[PDB]
Design an enzyme around this catalytic site. Structure first.
Site, PDB file in Angstrom:
ATOM      1  N   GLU A  95      42.961  -6.323 -32.025  1.00  0.00           N
ATOM      2  CA  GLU A  95      42.505  -7.238 -30.997  1.00  0.00           C
ATOM      3  C   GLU A  95      41.326  -6.754 -30.202  1.00  0.00           C
ATOM      4  OE1 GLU A  95      45.337  -5.560 -27.288  1.00  0.00           O
ATOM      5  OE2 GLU A  95      46.203  -7.163 -28.433  1.00  0.00           O
ATOM      6  N   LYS A 140      54.748   0.992 -29.115  1.00  0.00           N
ATOM      7  CA  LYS A 140      53.397   0.615 -29.379  1.00  0.00           C
ATOM      8  C   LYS A 140      52.501   1.810 -29.607  1.00  0.00           C
ATOM      9  CE  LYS A 140      51.012  -3.553 -28.546  1.00  0.00           C
ATOM     10  NZ  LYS A 140      49.925  -4.198 -27.765  1.00  0.00           N
ATOM     11  N   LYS A 177      54.086  -9.772 -16.793  1.00  0.00           N
ATOM     12  CA  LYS A 177      53.063 -10.381 -17.520  1.00  0.00           C
ATOM     13  C   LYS A 177      53.147 -11.872 -17.555  1.00  0.00           C
ATOM     14  CE  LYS A 177      52.643  -7.561 -21.309  1.00  0.00           C
ATOM     15  NZ  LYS A 177      53.139  -8.884 -21.793  1.00  0.00           N
ATOM     16  N   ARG A 201      59.123   0.359 -25.539  1.00  0.00           N
ATOM     17  CA  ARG A 201      58.752  -0.754 -24.693  1.00  0.00           C
ATOM     18  C   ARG A 201      59.681  -1.917 -24.916  1.00  0.00           C
ATOM     19  NH1 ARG A 201      53.619  -4.255 -25.288  1.00  0.00           N
ATOM     20  NH2 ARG A 201      55.203  -5.618 -26.339  1.00  0.00           N
ATOM     21  N   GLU A 239      43.003 -11.732 -30.452  1.00  0.00           N
ATOM     22  CA  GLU A 239      43.724 -11.148 -31.595  1.00  0.00           C
ATOM     23  C   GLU A 239      43.548 -11.910 -32.864  1.00  0.00           C
ATOM     24  OE1 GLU A 239      48.208 -11.374 -31.427  1.00  0.00           O
ATOM     25  OE2 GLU A 239      48.336 -10.254 -29.837  1.00  0.00           O
ATOM     26  N   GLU A 254      48.373  -4.524 -35.078  1.00  0.00           N
ATOM     27  CA  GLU A 254      47.876  -5.622 -34.079  1.00  0.00           C
ATOM     28  C   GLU A 254      46.367  -5.338 -33.943  1.00  0.00           C
ATOM     29  OE1 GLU A 254      47.842  -4.647 -29.787  1.00  0.00           O
ATOM     30  OE2 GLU A 254      49.167  -6.451 -29.798  1.00  0.00           O
TER      31      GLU A 254
HETATM   32 MN   LIG Z   1      48.061  -8.440 -28.424  1.00  0.00          MN
END
Ligand SMILES: [Mn+2]
Ligand SMILES: [Mn+2]
Lengths: 288, 288
Positions: free
Chosen positions: B69, B166, B213, B150, B245, B67
């Site tokens: 970002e 992660k 979130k 997670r 991202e 990922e």
């Molecule tokens: Mn992200």
């Protein structure tokens, strides 16, 4: 901005310097942004804002004497003899009180870069693109009361070719930690001495500093830039100087067209930085 | 580079990342440089070099979980509570032992940028260019022994949609002293948990951290980017988190073509950086 001058701390219009638009260059495989503009990077906007502030500062009647030049060396601060070492790792404007830069690269890289530029000028693809001038001058400085008049005599014909009061208006240090040299961007004024003739008052008294300059200049007219590579003797300490100069008339011209067409000034500045980068990166690549 | 991984201190081939060429964009009034190229600025190069090195350090079979970002915050160092203030004035890679950024901006600035972006997505000119995705998810973190798993449940249908480890591989901080927030670039991996199912072992025990979130996602497919605007409740401290991202697939794909055609990779990173600068400059112009 064309008929008046306003001190930097009092300036209020900053007419907007436009970002390049996604032009006609091969319908890109990827959009450059979600606005389809290319934003200027910081350092380029920093230069674009500093140059504009600083020209705007100077009286209109003085702007034709401007000299905008980039010179290489090492930034040194007030406490230590070595290259500064802030905690950054990509080139930035550097702003520490009393940080200074003396124009001076290593002789051997100096000989090596000059060969490379000659080489590029000598490529058949670029045979009509540079113009080379070699020139050897002695620069004698006379103090008057006091102000310093710089007299430039060339060596190949005793002629007294340039008689000025050089003034350093402003400078920006660009700390360039990925490279072996940093750069100094200087905004100077080359003030023409009036009627007080070179020969009649000065070619009889003792200069306080004399500098011999052996130089080759590469002028690349289509990018409005001139590269000067010079050995200078400080009458005798020697310095190897590498300086890029942007063309004053086109800079003046684009600065007067900022409000109506921002693209001319923004491209000139981008172009000047673009050149100084080639340089800088080639110097570092010979250092390895 | 596509079939092996080497640790960052051991790498030796850095394949050249080509500088843009003066392409067919409006036969420019000025040459870009005396080589007829545009050199990449030092920040963009830097990110070029770090994303490459960092991908290359990762095992090929893990690459698809990358990922990459950007995020918005302030850089704080180890000694003091305020924003660092090294002696520099344009944005640059910052490198100080134990300086850190926590993703968090002021909530009205947040609300004002998310009206900025939805307005641009609602413009008639960009009706086919954005894709908006709202999502509300609760993220619960189970420690096993020790590793952190997670698990993400969404709130509008108690499903357990994402279970992962992660891992933060790397990061780079961009100290932005012309802007109100500086930026962290983070290259993470999202490792999907194997057969150890979410329901059967963890939907019974005590999470060590739980995060609600609330997010909107604007996905700008032709610049291969996704903006995430997220309010997060730290079960409850609140933080407002602005993250951009780059698309993984397109990134891996350009990464694998770097030796053959550098352009794809060079273009993507620039695009990434240009959208970033767009959001960071928008934020700053809302703080004024
Ligand atoms: Mn992200
Ligand atoms: Mn000069």
């Amino acid at each position: 901005h064309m008929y008046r001058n306003v001190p930097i701390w009092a300036q209020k219009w900053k007419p907007t310097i436009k970002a390049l638009q996604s032009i006609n260059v091969k319908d890109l495989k990827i959009d450059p942004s979600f606005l389809n503009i290319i934003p200027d990077d910081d350092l380029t906007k920093s230069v674009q804002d500093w140059v504009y502030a600083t020209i705007y500062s100077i009286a209109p009647e003085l702007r034709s004497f401007i000299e905008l030049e980039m010179k290489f060396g090492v930034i040194i601060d007030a406490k230590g003899p070595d290259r500064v070492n802030p905690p950054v790792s990509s080139q930035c404007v550097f702003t520490e009180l009393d940080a200074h830069l003396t124009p001076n690269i290593d002789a051997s890289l100096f000989k090596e870069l000059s060969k490379y530029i000659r080489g590029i000028s000598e490529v058949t693809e670029n045979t009509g693109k540079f113009s080379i001038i070699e020139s050897q001058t002695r620069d004698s400085v006379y103090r008057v009361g006091p102000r310093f008049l710089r007299m430039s005599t060339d060596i190949k014909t005793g002629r007294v070719g340039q008689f000025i009061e050089k003034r350093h208006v402003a400078q920006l240090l660009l700390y360039s930690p990925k490279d072996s040299y940093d750069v100094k961007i200087s905004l100077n004024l080359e003030l023409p001495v009036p009627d007080n003739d070179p020969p009649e008052k000065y070619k009889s008294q003792s200069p306080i500093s004399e500098r011999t300059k052996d130089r080759v200049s590469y002028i690349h007219n289509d990018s409005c830039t001139r590269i000067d590579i010079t050995k200078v003797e400080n009458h005798s300490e020697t310095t190897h100087e590498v300086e890029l100069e942007i063309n004053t008339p086109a800079l003046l011209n684009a600065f007067d067209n900022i409000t109506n067409d921002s693209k001319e000034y923004a491209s000139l500045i981008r172009t000047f930085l673009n050149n100084g980068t080639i340089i800088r990166r080639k110097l570092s690549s010979l250092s390895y």
